[PDB]
Amino acid sequence: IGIRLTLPPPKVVDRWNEKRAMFGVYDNIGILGNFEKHPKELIRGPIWLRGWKGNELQRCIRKRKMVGSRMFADDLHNLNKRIRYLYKHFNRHGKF
Amino acid sequence: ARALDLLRGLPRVSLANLKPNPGSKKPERRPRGRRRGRKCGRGHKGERQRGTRPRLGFEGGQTPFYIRIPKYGFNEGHSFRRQYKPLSLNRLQYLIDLGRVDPSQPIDLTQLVNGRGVTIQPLKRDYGVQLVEEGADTFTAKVNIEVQLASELAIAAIEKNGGVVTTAFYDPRSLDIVCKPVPFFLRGQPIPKRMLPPEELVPYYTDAKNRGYLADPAKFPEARLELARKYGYILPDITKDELFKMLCTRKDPRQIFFGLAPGWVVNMADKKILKPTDENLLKYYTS
Amino acid sequence: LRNRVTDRYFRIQEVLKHARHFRGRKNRCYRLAVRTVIRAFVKCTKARYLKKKNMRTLWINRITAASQEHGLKYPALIGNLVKCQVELNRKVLADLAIYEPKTFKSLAALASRRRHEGFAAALGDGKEPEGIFSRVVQYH
Amino acid sequence: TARGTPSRFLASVLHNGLGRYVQQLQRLSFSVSRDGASSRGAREFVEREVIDFARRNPGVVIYVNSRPCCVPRVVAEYLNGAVREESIHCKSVEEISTLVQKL
Amino acid sequence: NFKRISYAKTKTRAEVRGGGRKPWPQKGTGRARHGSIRSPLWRGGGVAHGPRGPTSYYYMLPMKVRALGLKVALTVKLAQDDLHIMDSLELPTGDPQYLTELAHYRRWGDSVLLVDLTHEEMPQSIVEATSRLKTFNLIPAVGLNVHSMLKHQTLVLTLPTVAFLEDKLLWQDSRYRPLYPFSLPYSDFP
Amino acid sequence: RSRAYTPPEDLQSRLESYVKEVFLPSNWQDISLEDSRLKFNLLAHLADDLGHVVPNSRLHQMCRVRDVLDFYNVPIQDRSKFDELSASNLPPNLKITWSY
Amino acid sequence: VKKGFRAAFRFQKELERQRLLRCPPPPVRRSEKPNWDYHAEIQAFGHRLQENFSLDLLKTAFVNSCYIKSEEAKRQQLKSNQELSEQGTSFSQTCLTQFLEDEYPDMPTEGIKNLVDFLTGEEVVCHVARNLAVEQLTLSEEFPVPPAVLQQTFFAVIGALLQSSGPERTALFIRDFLITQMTGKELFEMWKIINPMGLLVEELKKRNVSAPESRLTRQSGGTTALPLYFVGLYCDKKLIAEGPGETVLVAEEEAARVALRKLYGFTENRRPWNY
RNA sequence: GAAAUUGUGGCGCAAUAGAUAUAGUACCGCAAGGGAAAGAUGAAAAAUUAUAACCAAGCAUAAUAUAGCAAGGACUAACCCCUAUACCUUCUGCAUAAUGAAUUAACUAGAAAUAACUUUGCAAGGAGAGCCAAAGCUAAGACCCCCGAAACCAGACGA
Ligand SMILES: [Mg+2]
Ligand SMILES: [Mg+2]
Ligand SMILES: [Mg+2]
Ligand SMILES: [Mg+2]
Ligand SMILES: [Mg+2]
Ligand SMILES: [Mg+2]
Ligand SMILES: [Mg+2]
Ligand SMILES: [Mg+2]
Ligand SMILES: [Mg+2]
Ligand SMILES: [Mg+2]
Ligand SMILES: [Mg+2]
Ligand SMILES: [Mg+2]
Ligand SMILES: [Mg+2]
């Protein structure tokens, strides 16, 4: 019986956390900051996709180029395999 | 506004209010349910439903339409074709009217670019502007123009108005520099000497009947006269009018820019222009 | 798993509610229940048409029964009533037969009379008075 | 279906049509929220169309609780003892009014 | 959405450990045909169409559009009586309580956005007051933005900040094509 | 404090007097404020007197003194919603309650 | 451990419902349940029936002696009904007598009395009260309200009404409410008796100065164990009534009953009665 | 398929998920190698307390009564009357005596842009360089599955 008896502990959420209070502050820095910095330089993330939208396969490719050199053998291989698969799936398998 | 007034009523516009305009966001058709599940838009067995359908163009083993036709040089040497973005006289006139592009100064490519009449792009092998006949009549400029090709009619039009059409040549590299000079400056190299016509453009720019910058200026007046004879109207003598001093300036070649020599290094921050000295370097620049 | 169904029990229960009173696993096991419940639903929808037919047949049977007690057949009766312009529906006629027998008897008599009149008319091809319980009220 | 559902016969409580038609509705209990889109329609009804309704039928005695309710309900209590309890959740004002009338 | 880089990953049937071997032969056994233990149908097999990779959701709205949005937001704030201009930000005390009291008196709101330019020319007192107050937030005008405005029940701008805004936001109107990026100098632009 | 405001009870004359004090001629209602300083003087003074500040959403609207007068003449009442409900001639069927 | 909340809540609700179904509470009086204003409800009640009356005077018609006693006890730790209730009972009875007499004069006095009793007895009246929502507004010691108490309350209400508007109005009300509980109900259900034959004989004597013979009209079965004896009742070679039965005695009894009904202006036919 | 040239967290999982992992253990394998499962009290077990229960299938409490896809129309009545050829798939066509499915539980399958359409933005221009532009251009939104061989080859391990 997947459904349960004890209803959960109350999910407390401060909507005025230091994160949420200042979410989006400085974001939009170009159009009112003499274009010193692009908003794409605000974002913090994995280097291979920083201000770059991409696609599944494309992302993989980017990762392989940007980072692959300094990537863990067990994971690099996996990445390569993924790329191989992904190309096949896109360039051949689907509809239209 | 009425809308603003209305907004005095209604609640404060919060994140809990907001909604995208109808039509902007389409519903997402995903395949769970009796309408969109079961065969799920794929059909029945075969090579459709399994994916695996053969490539685009293939015609089931009949020779493909694209392969059945014979080859032919339509796009044979297209990356080695010179491509000239056209500027119609009408456009030029409009620009003049609007204030951007000042006819009291010379009209070089750079000026035009700044104005944003003619956008051009060295990648995709543009070799500059070509002056075109489109606003032949209904034109009134009286201006000198450095332009990379010119129709005869266009030339005539300008001349009748008391202007000076001079054609000029910008190598792809030179052209790039011309188009956006500030980025070149930022890059930090010395302003290079532009190269000459390659081989088959040399006979163009050495003739005075298309106002070539290497053509002998003794024949220019003759050419002008000839033009006048053909298309009616009288040549306005240039020497008498007040702007002659500016109309005489001719961008003496391997210079790129109208004031700056080849070999100048333009320091933008802390505004100076560094010049080369050193005899050999100077000689090279001259060459 | 990102998002998996918390509310599935309820869906199961929705169908099992309708299956409670079936025999055997049909009322316990959701898979079997669903098929049965749907079938039941289908039957119910179909049954509406059947019900109406059945009722009318029952009424006809009752009226026939009543009519035979007065020496008349159903069809004769109905036809004569139609001729008379007495347009009582068969539910109502059945009710009459059950609950208000003298009225039913009277109706039967009337029908018989009408029939007789018709018969009479048939002998003499045309004319004269058409008979008293014959004729028709003309609306204009 | 009819086999599943419990059945009933037609009747009228305490012979209403004979003597006097008696309003069988005793009480409408309106659980509403002060804040919450759940009960905007309900709020509107309370503001404008409830008083009029009350005036129209004085045998009914309306209650309105305003009880920070996440889902608003209107509890209709009848003369026999039965309690028809129905939701007002994100309904338009007109619809709500209609529902009330039906009750 | 433009910053959002979702970090959710799962293992495809390739990336899960082992199971390249046929569990039992295809045709002999009376079981379901299978190729790999670790196929999606199996317990602790690979995920079919799971989330995979850090996914970036980045997209650039036209700068002009962004500007318009800001302008629109400002308009809304003024229209709705929630915008308040100040001669300056300057609290005599620099106490959190005091500010709150003032707000209450003036019927400002639950939360109050305070805006005054630079960051470096901030009044100390105001800084002191806001810092402890969760809701009463300070931003330089460079940081002012739509979402924040939406969040906060009031907008409180200085005159200089207003001026700055005017300067910036009207410049998206009556301008040229970029030609090249505005970080590079031009004649007019700073 | 209170948002509640009743329009006077004089007012029409008082406003005129104020105007005179600030800046007198014929057609006093038809005077355009236009000059900013004058506007600041008048409106602020009125607010100080009446306890009724002109909204900055509505500030652009009143160009003339007539507009200002019109604005002043309409009432505002704080009340609270329960109170309002109570006021609004409740028949003996209704029993509204507030659980806060 | 799934990620939600709503589902859990729903489940909890369901569980609660189940519990309620299983072990329900000792049914509580409506005054204790939250939404409830006494005066307002009284007013509503007054409005509902379509005749106005004094609210101070009505309120007292609900207050019971037991309740008063309880209150006193509580205090230790009002007028009451009697004056009105008695009046209500008596006047109501009189009204009933008048109506019935007007309708069917061939009914005997005893029969009429019985009918009245049935109308105003512990059951029917109680039922009526329940239907009307008297039980809610009444306030007594203990719960559910015992039937006698309910009856008393009802009569007090009637008395109050009489005091307020007028006799005619009260009569009308009575007609509407109490008397409409003999609509389907034939005689003998209301005024139950033993040995109808004797009664018939007496009635016959009163009327014609004669005695009835009891002939047997029809019979299917008899030896079957499911007979249908259809037995008449003849007076000077003319049947006054005729009834059916499983046995002959039963049939005779039925016939007698039918005859009685015929005599006392009843039958199933009757006349609809004017409202 | 190039080059010049240009240039200290989480809208994550939370015990069939997340690592194969409470473990590379147990177990299987001559060996290389394969490779699991599962735990869940309370502040206190130096409180064994007593209640928290109520909820899958399966059972039990509770065997059965003519007749028939398990029901529906009903009916005062559970049956009795009348109506009624399970489902999915695969088929020209299936009650078929064609496939699949004992049942419950949880897990288990449409993912990609050109080109279109849409609604915003700006507009002879658009676009945060490069790209496109004889109304365009920028923007988002919206289409494109899962399971299954016999096989081939590389490198180990086994007489
Ligand atoms: Mg299916
Ligand atoms: Mg298929
Ligand atoms: Mg096929
Ligand atoms: Mg061939
Ligand atoms: Mg593998
Ligand atoms: Mg395989
Ligand atoms: Mg796994
Ligand atoms: Mg695990
Ligand atoms: Mg069970
Ligand atoms: Mg049968
Ligand atoms: Mg087969
Ligand atoms: Mg092969
Ligand atoms: Mg050996």
PDB file of N, CA and C in Angstrom, chain F residues 32-86:
ATOM      1  N   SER F  32      -4.638  76.993 -14.043  1.00  0.00           N
ATOM      2  CA  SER F  32      -3.684  75.903 -14.225  1.00  0.00           C
ATOM      3  C   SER F  32      -2.533  76.090 -13.248  1.00  0.00           C
ATOM      4  N   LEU F  33      -2.130  75.006 -12.586  1.00  0.00           N
ATOM      5  CA  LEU F  33      -1.013  75.049 -11.639  1.00  0.00           C
ATOM      6  C   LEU F  33       0.287  75.256 -12.419  1.00  0.00           C
ATOM      7  N   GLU F  34       0.610  74.302 -13.296  1.00  0.00           N
ATOM      8  CA  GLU F  34       1.693  74.426 -14.295  1.00  0.00           C
ATOM      9  C   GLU F  34       3.092  74.633 -13.686  1.00  0.00           C
ATOM     10  N   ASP F  35       3.318  75.791 -13.057  1.00  0.00           N
ATOM     11  CA  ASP F  35       4.529  76.038 -12.269  1.00  0.00           C
ATOM     12  C   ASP F  35       4.576  75.058 -11.101  1.00  0.00           C
ATOM     13  N   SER F  36       5.744  74.460 -10.895  1.00  0.00           N
ATOM     14  CA  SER F  36       5.888  73.321 -10.007  1.00  0.00           C
ATOM     15  C   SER F  36       5.885  73.772  -8.559  1.00  0.00           C
ATOM     16  N   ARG F  37       6.613  74.861  -8.294  1.00  0.00           N
ATOM     17  CA  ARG F  37       6.771  75.398  -6.950  1.00  0.00           C
ATOM     18  C   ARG F  37       5.415  75.715  -6.335  1.00  0.00           C
ATOM     19  N   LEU F  38       4.605  76.391  -7.139  1.00  0.00           N
ATOM     20  CA  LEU F  38       3.252  76.804  -6.747  1.00  0.00           C
ATOM     21  C   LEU F  38       2.426  75.585  -6.347  1.00  0.00           C
ATOM     22  N   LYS F  39       2.510  74.573  -7.206  1.00  0.00           N
ATOM     23  CA  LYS F  39       1.788  73.310  -7.017  1.00  0.00           C
ATOM     24  C   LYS F  39       2.182  72.680  -5.685  1.00  0.00           C
ATOM     25  N   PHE F  40       3.495  72.656  -5.459  1.00  0.00           N
ATOM     26  CA  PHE F  40       4.072  72.084  -4.242  1.00  0.00           C
ATOM     27  C   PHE F  40       3.518  72.799  -3.013  1.00  0.00           C
ATOM     28  N   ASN F  41       3.511  74.124  -3.107  1.00  0.00           N
ATOM     29  CA  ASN F  41       3.031  74.993  -2.032  1.00  0.00           C
ATOM     30  C   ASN F  41       1.583  74.668  -1.706  1.00  0.00           C
ATOM     31  N   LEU F  42       0.780  74.523  -2.766  1.00  0.00           N
ATOM     32  CA  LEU F  42      -0.702  74.594  -2.566  1.00  0.00           C
ATOM     33  C   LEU F  42      -1.132  73.240  -1.947  1.00  0.00           C
ATOM     34  N   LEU F  43      -0.770  72.219  -2.720  1.00  0.00           N
ATOM     35  CA  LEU F  43      -1.199  70.846  -2.450  1.00  0.00           C
ATOM     36  C   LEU F  43      -0.719  70.409  -1.082  1.00  0.00           C
ATOM     37  N   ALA F  44       0.553  70.710  -0.809  1.00  0.00           N
ATOM     38  CA  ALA F  44       1.181  70.344   0.469  1.00  0.00           C
ATOM     39  C   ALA F  44       0.425  70.987   1.620  1.00  0.00           C
ATOM     40  N   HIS F  45       0.113  72.275   1.435  1.00  0.00           N
ATOM     41  CA  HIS F  45      -0.611  73.041   2.458  1.00  0.00           C
ATOM     42  C   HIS F  45      -1.962  72.403   2.738  1.00  0.00           C
ATOM     43  N   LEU F  46      -2.640  72.038   1.653  1.00  0.00           N
ATOM     44  CA  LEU F  46      -3.959  71.404   1.729  1.00  0.00           C
ATOM     45  C   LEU F  46      -3.875  70.112   2.540  1.00  0.00           C
ATOM     46  N   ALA F  47      -2.852  69.330   2.218  1.00  0.00           N
ATOM     47  CA  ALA F  47      -2.599  68.048   2.879  1.00  0.00           C
ATOM     48  C   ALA F  47      -2.416  68.254   4.377  1.00  0.00           C
ATOM     49  N   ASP F  48      -1.609  69.259   4.696  1.00  0.00           N
ATOM     50  CA  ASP F  48      -1.303  69.624   6.083  1.00  0.00           C
ATOM     51  C   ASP F  48      -2.579  69.957   6.831  1.00  0.00           C
ATOM     52  N   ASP F  49      -3.415  70.760   6.173  1.00  0.00           N
ATOM     53  CA  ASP F  49      -4.717  71.160   6.730  1.00  0.00           C
ATOM     54  C   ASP F  49      -5.714  69.991   6.855  1.00  0.00           C
ATOM     55  N   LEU F  50      -6.029  69.375   5.719  1.00  0.00           N
ATOM     56  CA  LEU F  50      -7.099  68.376   5.634  1.00  0.00           C
ATOM     57  C   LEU F  50      -6.702  66.969   6.106  1.00  0.00           C
ATOM     58  N   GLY F  51      -5.399  66.690   6.188  1.00  0.00           N
ATOM     59  CA  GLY F  51      -4.899  65.357   6.544  1.00  0.00           C
ATOM     60  C   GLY F  51      -5.183  64.355   5.441  1.00  0.00           C
ATOM     61  N   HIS F  52      -4.867  64.749   4.209  1.00  0.00           N
ATOM     62  CA  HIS F  52      -5.295  64.031   3.011  1.00  0.00           C
ATOM     63  C   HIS F  52      -4.321  64.334   1.871  1.00  0.00           C
ATOM     64  N   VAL F  53      -3.268  63.525   1.784  1.00  0.00           N
ATOM     65  CA  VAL F  53      -2.205  63.736   0.805  1.00  0.00           C
ATOM     66  C   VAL F  53      -2.700  63.302  -0.574  1.00  0.00           C
ATOM     67  N   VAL F  54      -2.302  64.047  -1.605  1.00  0.00           N
ATOM     68  CA  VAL F  54      -2.635  63.704  -2.987  1.00  0.00           C
ATOM     69  C   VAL F  54      -1.754  62.509  -3.376  1.00  0.00           C
ATOM     70  N   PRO F  55      -2.356  61.413  -3.888  1.00  0.00           N
ATOM     71  CA  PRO F  55      -1.533  60.285  -4.345  1.00  0.00           C
ATOM     72  C   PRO F  55      -0.602  60.647  -5.501  1.00  0.00           C
ATOM     73  N   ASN F  56       0.626  60.130  -5.472  1.00  0.00           N
ATOM     74  CA  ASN F  56       1.581  60.338  -6.578  1.00  0.00           C
ATOM     75  C   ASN F  56       1.233  59.572  -7.867  1.00  0.00           C
ATOM     76  N   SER F  57       0.308  58.616  -7.776  1.00  0.00           N
ATOM     77  CA  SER F  57      -0.339  58.030  -8.957  1.00  0.00           C
ATOM     78  C   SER F  57      -1.295  59.012  -9.646  1.00  0.00           C
ATOM     79  N   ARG F  58      -1.919  59.883  -8.852  1.00  0.00           N
ATOM     80  CA  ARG F  58      -2.905  60.864  -9.321  1.00  0.00           C
ATOM     81  C   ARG F  58      -2.330  62.282  -9.529  1.00  0.00           C
ATOM     82  N   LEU F  59      -1.028  62.475  -9.289  1.00  0.00           N
ATOM     83  CA  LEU F  59      -0.419  63.825  -9.252  1.00  0.00           C
ATOM     84  C   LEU F  59      -0.394  64.488 -10.637  1.00  0.00           C
ATOM     85  N   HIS F  60       0.050  63.729 -11.640  1.00  0.00           N
ATOM     86  CA  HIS F  60       0.013  64.144 -13.057  1.00  0.00           C
ATOM     87  C   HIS F  60      -1.375  64.618 -13.536  1.00  0.00           C
ATOM     88  N   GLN F  61      -2.435  64.013 -12.988  1.00  0.00           N
ATOM     89  CA  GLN F  61      -3.816  64.243 -13.432  1.00  0.00           C
ATOM     90  C   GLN F  61      -4.291  65.684 -13.227  1.00  0.00           C
ATOM     91  N   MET F  62      -4.261  66.156 -11.979  1.00  0.00           N
ATOM     92  CA  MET F  62      -4.760  67.504 -11.654  1.00  0.00           C
ATOM     93  C   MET F  62      -3.831  68.619 -12.151  1.00  0.00           C
ATOM     94  N   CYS F  63      -4.129  69.122 -13.348  1.00  0.00           N
ATOM     95  CA  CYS F  63      -3.426  70.270 -13.927  1.00  0.00           C
ATOM     96  C   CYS F  63      -4.003  71.586 -13.397  1.00  0.00           C
ATOM     97  N   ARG F  64      -5.332  71.699 -13.416  1.00  0.00           N
ATOM     98  CA  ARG F  64      -6.046  72.878 -12.901  1.00  0.00           C
ATOM     99  C   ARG F  64      -6.305  72.788 -11.396  1.00  0.00           C
ATOM    100  N   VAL F  65      -6.741  73.905 -10.810  1.00  0.00           N
ATOM    101  CA  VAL F  65      -7.240  73.927  -9.414  1.00  0.00           C
ATOM    102  C   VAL F  65      -8.609  73.261  -9.257  1.00  0.00           C
ATOM    103  N   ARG F  66      -9.406  73.323 -10.335  1.00  0.00           N
ATOM    104  CA  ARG F  66     -10.713  72.681 -10.367  1.00  0.00           C
ATOM    105  C   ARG F  66     -10.577  71.185 -10.126  1.00  0.00           C
ATOM    106  N   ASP F  67      -9.587  70.588 -10.785  1.00  0.00           N
ATOM    107  CA  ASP F  67      -9.323  69.152 -10.660  1.00  0.00           C
ATOM    108  C   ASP F  67      -9.021  68.800  -9.204  1.00  0.00           C
ATOM    109  N   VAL F  68      -8.177  69.628  -8.598  1.00  0.00           N
ATOM    110  CA  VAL F  68      -7.770  69.462  -7.199  1.00  0.00           C
ATOM    111  C   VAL F  68      -8.996  69.485  -6.293  1.00  0.00           C
ATOM    112  N   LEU F  69      -9.849  70.472  -6.552  1.00  0.00           N
ATOM    113  CA  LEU F  69     -11.090  70.669  -5.795  1.00  0.00           C
ATOM    114  C   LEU F  69     -11.958  69.417  -5.877  1.00  0.00           C
ATOM    115  N   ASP F  70     -12.083  68.918  -7.100  1.00  0.00           N
ATOM    116  CA  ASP F  70     -12.877  67.721  -7.395  1.00  0.00           C
ATOM    117  C   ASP F  70     -12.361  66.539  -6.586  1.00  0.00           C
ATOM    118  N   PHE F  71     -11.038  66.395  -6.610  1.00  0.00           N
ATOM    119  CA  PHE F  71     -10.347  65.314  -5.905  1.00  0.00           C
ATOM    120  C   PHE F  71     -10.666  65.388  -4.405  1.00  0.00           C
ATOM    121  N   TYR F  72     -10.575  66.605  -3.883  1.00  0.00           N
ATOM    122  CA  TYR F  72     -10.812  66.845  -2.467  1.00  0.00           C
ATOM    123  C   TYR F  72     -12.237  66.469  -2.099  1.00  0.00           C
ATOM    124  N   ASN F  73     -13.181  66.840  -2.968  1.00  0.00           N
ATOM    125  CA  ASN F  73     -14.605  66.664  -2.680  1.00  0.00           C
ATOM    126  C   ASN F  73     -15.103  65.218  -2.544  1.00  0.00           C
ATOM    127  N   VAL F  74     -14.403  64.243  -3.131  1.00  0.00           N
ATOM    128  CA  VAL F  74     -14.805  62.830  -3.002  1.00  0.00           C
ATOM    129  C   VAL F  74     -14.296  62.243  -1.673  1.00  0.00           C
ATOM    130  N   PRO F  75     -15.095  61.368  -1.023  1.00  0.00           N
ATOM    131  CA  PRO F  75     -14.714  60.835   0.285  1.00  0.00           C
ATOM    132  C   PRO F  75     -13.883  59.551   0.218  1.00  0.00           C
ATOM    133  N   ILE F  76     -13.173  59.264   1.309  1.00  0.00           N
ATOM    134  CA  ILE F  76     -12.478  57.986   1.517  1.00  0.00           C
ATOM    135  C   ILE F  76     -12.754  57.526   2.953  1.00  0.00           C
ATOM    136  N   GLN F  77     -12.949  56.218   3.132  1.00  0.00           N
ATOM    137  CA  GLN F  77     -13.298  55.635   4.432  1.00  0.00           C
ATOM    138  C   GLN F  77     -12.521  54.329   4.648  1.00  0.00           C
ATOM    139  N   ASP F  78     -11.849  54.214   5.797  1.00  0.00           N
ATOM    140  CA  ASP F  78     -11.007  53.050   6.107  1.00  0.00           C
ATOM    141  C   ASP F  78     -11.865  51.828   6.444  1.00  0.00           C
ATOM    142  N   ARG F  79     -12.647  51.929   7.521  1.00  0.00           N
ATOM    143  CA  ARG F  79     -13.685  50.947   7.878  1.00  0.00           C
ATOM    144  C   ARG F  79     -13.185  49.561   8.342  1.00  0.00           C
ATOM    145  N   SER F  80     -12.567  48.803   7.427  1.00  0.00           N
ATOM    146  CA  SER F  80     -12.323  47.344   7.537  1.00  0.00           C
ATOM    147  C   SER F  80     -13.570  46.593   7.055  1.00  0.00           C
ATOM    148  N   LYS F  81     -13.374  45.394   6.506  1.00  0.00           N
ATOM    149  CA  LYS F  81     -14.392  44.766   5.671  1.00  0.00           C
ATOM    150  C   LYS F  81     -15.515  44.195   6.497  1.00  0.00           C
ATOM    151  N   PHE F  82     -15.162  43.588   7.629  1.00  0.00           N
ATOM    152  CA  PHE F  82     -16.144  43.046   8.575  1.00  0.00           C
ATOM    153  C   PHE F  82     -17.082  44.155   9.046  1.00  0.00           C
ATOM    154  N   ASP F  83     -16.468  45.283   9.396  1.00  0.00           N
ATOM    155  CA  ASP F  83     -17.206  46.457   9.877  1.00  0.00           C
ATOM    156  C   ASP F  83     -18.199  46.920   8.821  1.00  0.00           C
ATOM    157  N   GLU F  84     -17.711  46.982   7.589  1.00  0.00           N
ATOM    158  CA  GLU F  84     -18.512  47.398   6.431  1.00  0.00           C
ATOM    159  C   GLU F  84     -19.729  46.492   6.285  1.00  0.00           C
ATOM    160  N   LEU F  85     -19.460  45.196   6.381  1.00  0.00           N
ATOM    161  CA  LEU F  85     -20.491  44.160   6.262  1.00  0.00           C
ATOM    162  C   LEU F  85     -21.569  44.372   7.322  1.00  0.00           C
ATOM    163  N   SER F  86     -21.100  44.611   8.541  1.00  0.00           N
ATOM    164  CA  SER F  86     -21.972  44.840   9.694  1.00  0.00           C
ATOM    165  C   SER F  86     -22.886  46.037   9.433  1.00  0.00           C
TER     166      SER F  86
END
